[PDB]
Design an enzyme around this catalytic site. Structure first.
Site, PDB file in Angstrom:
ATOM      1  N   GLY A  45      30.161 -24.701 -35.490  1.00  0.00           N
ATOM      2  CA  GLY A  45      29.457 -23.722 -34.672  1.00  0.00           C
ATOM      3  C   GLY A  45      30.187 -23.349 -33.389  1.00  0.00           C
ATOM      4  CB  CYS A  46      31.579 -25.436 -30.678  1.00  0.00           C
ATOM      5  SG  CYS A  46      30.005 -26.158 -30.232  1.00  0.00           S
TER       6      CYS A  46
END
Ligand code: NA
Ligand code: NA
Length: 157
Positions: A45-46
């Protein structure tokens, strides 16, 4: 116009960056600043969030805005993340969570029978005079960088 008031000392906190230099929020006076907080380097996600901002960097440039990503990972971790992903903006190694606490992004969850703290993915738009004019908290990655860009364009006009 401010949606958040930061402690005055926040603007003079030395922020360790990927690449081995420092900045401060006050040093960004005169242009718009997007500050995006994310929980951990090099996760799915990051990484997605960082690549989304990176892909839009020319659109942020057209507003003269700058972007800073922030987590509490080390400068070394940030250097490896930036190198692998090709980011053309800096990452703040907020190892002591000073900047995170100033923006109130360290949140507590009751889990595992304990009180567990962690960075909540959150983004802020800082005006050329250092005012926090928009905030996004508990951010879902999909569509986020586009939404931040749209909001910046709205505010900067
Ligand atoms: Na530091
Ligand atoms: Na600024």
């Amino acid at each position: 116009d401010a949606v958040l008031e930061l402690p005055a000392a926040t603007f003079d906190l030395p922020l360790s960056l990927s690449g081995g230099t420092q900045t401060t929020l006050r040093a960004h006076a005169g242009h718009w600043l997007v500050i995006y907080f994310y929980p951990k380097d090099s996760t799915p996600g990051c990484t997605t969030e960082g690549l989304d901002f990176n892909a839009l960097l020319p659109e942020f440039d057209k507003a003269g805005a700058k972007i800073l990503g922030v987590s509490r990972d080390s400068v070394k971790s940030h250097d490896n993340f930036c190198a692998k992903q090709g980011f053309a903006f800096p990452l703040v190694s907020d190892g002591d969570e000073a900047l995170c606490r100033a923006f109130d992004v360290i949140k507590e969850k009751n889990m595992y029978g304990k009180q567990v703290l962690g960075i909540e993915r959150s983004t802020f738009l800082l005006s050329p005079e250092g005012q926090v004019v928009q905030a996004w908290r508990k951010v879902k990655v999909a569509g986020h960088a586009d939404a931040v860009l749209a909001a910046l364009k709205a505010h900067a006009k």
